[PDB]
């Protein structure tokens, strides 16, 4: 399982390099890469790719032998073999690639993490936490599975409490604004 998942990630990376499509590894996988240790196995592989390259992404999935299950407003889900590819579109703005609705520096150009001895670009701790907190608003922490809870803890600790607090406050502010907009409209 774990080896298979790592191998798939390696393959997806290799395809992305061949396509000349930048890949930022996200979520728990990013956290593990940034830690340097694949601590936990994850059925879903969360990878961030520039949105404009959707056609290339479809080709990549086909090259992998998988099929794209569905395309959603926040990205596309693809089944590759027995593993799930969750693709988050990175939006190229101000000469920078940014995760949708996420703070600047979401997807650093630098080789942030390492997987299986291969250096990999990973989304920032801030981006990771932004996603998790966003998920928290959707689903209560009590409902959260151990893996997600642990991943959130690791990311928060690594980034630093104060920074995490700032992120939480920022996101709450964003959500409140969104609610107000909706209520007005």
Coordinates of N, CA and C in Angstrom, one line a residue, residues 36-106:
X36 N 9.9 14.8 6.0 CA 10.9 13.9 5.4 C 10.5 12.4 5.7
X37 N 9.4 12.2 6.3 CA 9.0 10.8 6.6 C 7.5 10.6 6.2
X38 N 7.3 9.6 5.4 CA 6.0 9.1 5.1 C 5.4 8.4 6.3
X39 N 4.9 9.2 7.3 CA 4.5 8.8 8.6 C 3.2 8.0 8.4
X40 N 2.2 8.4 7.6 CA 0.9 7.8 7.5 C 0.6 7.5 6.0
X41 N -0.2 6.4 5.8 CA -0.7 6.1 4.4 C -2.0 6.9 4.2
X42 N -2.1 7.3 2.9 CA -3.3 8.1 2.6 C -4.0 7.6 1.3
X43 N -5.2 7.2 1.4 CA -5.9 6.7 0.2 C -6.0 7.8 -0.9
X44 N -6.4 9.0 -0.5 CA -6.4 10.1 -1.4 C -5.0 10.8 -1.5
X45 N -4.6 11.0 -2.7 CA -3.4 11.8 -2.9 C -3.7 13.2 -3.4
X46 N -3.4 14.2 -2.6 CA -3.8 15.6 -2.9 C -2.6 16.3 -3.6
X47 N -2.8 16.6 -4.9 CA -1.7 17.2 -5.6 C -2.2 18.5 -6.3
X48 N -1.4 19.5 -6.3 CA -1.8 20.8 -6.8 C -1.1 21.1 -8.1
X49 N -1.9 21.3 -9.1 CA -1.5 21.6 -10.5 C -2.1 22.8 -11.1
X50 N -1.4 23.6 -11.9 CA -2.0 24.8 -12.5 C -3.2 24.5 -13.3
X51 N -4.3 25.3 -13.0 CA -5.6 25.0 -13.6 C -5.6 25.0 -15.1
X52 N -4.8 25.9 -15.7 CA -4.8 26.1 -17.2 C -4.4 24.8 -17.9
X53 N -3.7 23.9 -17.2 CA -3.1 22.8 -17.9 C -4.1 21.5 -17.8
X54 N -5.4 21.8 -17.6 CA -6.3 20.7 -17.4 C -6.1 19.6 -18.5
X55 N -6.0 20.0 -19.8 CA -5.8 19.0 -20.8 C -4.6 18.1 -20.6
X56 N -3.5 18.7 -20.3 CA -2.3 18.0 -20.0 C -2.5 17.1 -18.8
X57 N -3.3 17.6 -17.8 CA -3.6 16.7 -16.6 C -4.4 15.5 -17.0
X58 N -5.4 15.7 -17.9 CA -6.1 14.6 -18.4 C -5.2 13.6 -19.1
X59 N -4.3 14.1 -19.9 CA -3.3 13.2 -20.5 C -2.5 12.5 -19.5
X60 N -2.0 13.2 -18.5 CA -1.2 12.6 -17.4 C -1.9 11.4 -16.8
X61 N -3.2 11.6 -16.5 CA -4.0 10.6 -15.8 C -4.1 9.4 -16.8
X62 N -4.3 9.6 -18.1 CA -4.4 8.6 -19.1 C -3.1 7.8 -19.2
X63 N -2.0 8.6 -19.1 CA -0.7 7.9 -19.2 C -0.5 7.0 -18.0
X64 N -0.9 7.5 -16.8 CA -0.9 6.7 -15.6 C -1.8 5.5 -15.7
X65 N -2.7 5.5 -16.6 CA -3.7 4.4 -16.8 C -5.0 4.6 -16.0
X66 N -5.1 5.8 -15.3 CA -6.3 6.1 -14.6 C -7.3 6.8 -15.4
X67 N -8.5 7.0 -14.8 CA -9.5 7.8 -15.5 C -10.0 8.9 -14.6
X68 N -10.3 10.1 -15.2 CA -10.8 11.2 -14.4 C -12.3 11.0 -14.0
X69 N -12.5 10.9 -12.7 CA -13.9 10.5 -12.3 C -14.9 11.7 -12.5
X70 N -14.5 12.9 -12.1 CA -15.3 14.1 -12.2 C -14.5 15.4 -12.1
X71 N -15.1 16.4 -12.6 CA -14.5 17.8 -12.5 C -15.4 18.7 -11.6
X72 N -14.8 19.3 -10.6 CA -15.6 20.1 -9.7 C -15.1 21.5 -9.6
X73 N -15.9 22.4 -9.1 CA -15.5 23.8 -9.0 C -14.1 24.0 -8.4
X74 N -13.8 23.2 -7.4 CA -12.6 23.3 -6.6 C -11.5 22.3 -7.1
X75 N -11.7 21.7 -8.2 CA -10.7 20.8 -8.8 C -11.3 19.5 -9.3
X76 N -10.5 18.6 -9.9 CA -11.0 17.4 -10.4 C -10.6 16.2 -9.6
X77 N -11.4 15.2 -9.5 CA -11.1 13.9 -8.9 C -10.9 12.9 -9.9
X78 N -9.7 12.2 -9.8 CA -9.4 11.1 -10.8 C -9.1 9.8 -10.1
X79 N -9.5 8.7 -10.6 CA -9.2 7.4 -10.1 C -8.0 6.9 -10.8
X80 N -6.9 6.7 -10.1 CA -5.7 6.0 -10.8 C -5.5 4.7 -10.1
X81 N -5.7 3.6 -10.9 CA -5.6 2.3 -10.3 C -6.6 2.2 -9.1
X82 N -6.0 1.8 -7.9 CA -6.8 1.6 -6.7 C -6.6 2.8 -5.8
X83 N -6.0 3.9 -6.3 CA -5.8 5.1 -5.5 C -6.4 6.3 -6.1
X84 N -6.8 7.3 -5.2 CA -7.6 8.4 -5.7 C -6.7 9.7 -5.8
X85 N -6.7 10.3 -7.0 CA -6.0 11.6 -7.2 C -6.9 12.8 -7.0
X86 N -6.7 13.5 -5.9 CA -7.4 14.8 -5.7 C -6.6 16.0 -6.2
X87 N -7.0 16.5 -7.4 CA -6.2 17.6 -8.0 C -6.8 19.0 -7.6
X88 N -6.0 19.8 -6.9 CA -6.3 21.1 -6.6 C -5.7 22.1 -7.6
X89 N -6.5 22.8 -8.3 CA -6.0 23.8 -9.3 C -5.2 24.9 -8.7
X90 N -4.0 25.2 -9.2 CA -3.2 26.3 -8.8 C -3.4 27.4 -9.8
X91 N -3.8 28.6 -9.3 CA -4.1 29.7 -10.3 C -2.9 30.7 -10.4
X92 N -2.5 30.8 -11.7 CA -1.3 31.6 -11.9 C -1.7 33.1 -12.0
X93 N -1.4 33.8 -10.9 CA -1.8 35.2 -10.8 C -0.6 36.1 -10.2
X94 N -0.5 37.3 -10.7 CA 0.7 38.1 -10.3 C 2.0 37.4 -10.4
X95 N 2.1 36.7 -11.5 CA 3.3 35.9 -11.8 C 3.6 34.9 -10.6
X96 N 2.5 34.4 -10.0 CA 2.7 33.4 -8.9 C 1.6 32.4 -9.0
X97 N 1.9 31.1 -8.6 CA 0.8 30.1 -8.6 C 0.2 30.0 -7.2
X98 N -1.1 30.2 -7.1 CA -1.7 30.3 -5.8 C -2.9 29.3 -5.7
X99 N -3.0 28.7 -4.5 CA -4.2 27.8 -4.3 C -5.4 28.7 -4.1
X100 N -6.6 28.2 -4.7 CA -7.8 29.0 -4.8 C -8.2 29.5 -3.4
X101 N -8.4 30.8 -3.3 CA -8.9 31.3 -2.0 C -7.9 31.2 -0.9
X102 N -6.6 31.1 -1.2 CA -5.6 30.9 -0.2 C -4.6 32.0 -0.2
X103 N -4.0 32.3 1.0 CA -3.0 33.3 1.1 C -1.8 33.2 0.2
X104 N -1.2 34.4 -0.2 CA 0.0 34.4 -1.0 C 1.1 33.5 -0.4
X105 N 1.9 32.8 -1.2 CA 2.9 31.9 -0.7 C 2.3 30.5 -0.5
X106 N 1.1 30.3 -1.0 CA 0.4 28.9 -0.9 C 1.3 27.9 -1.5

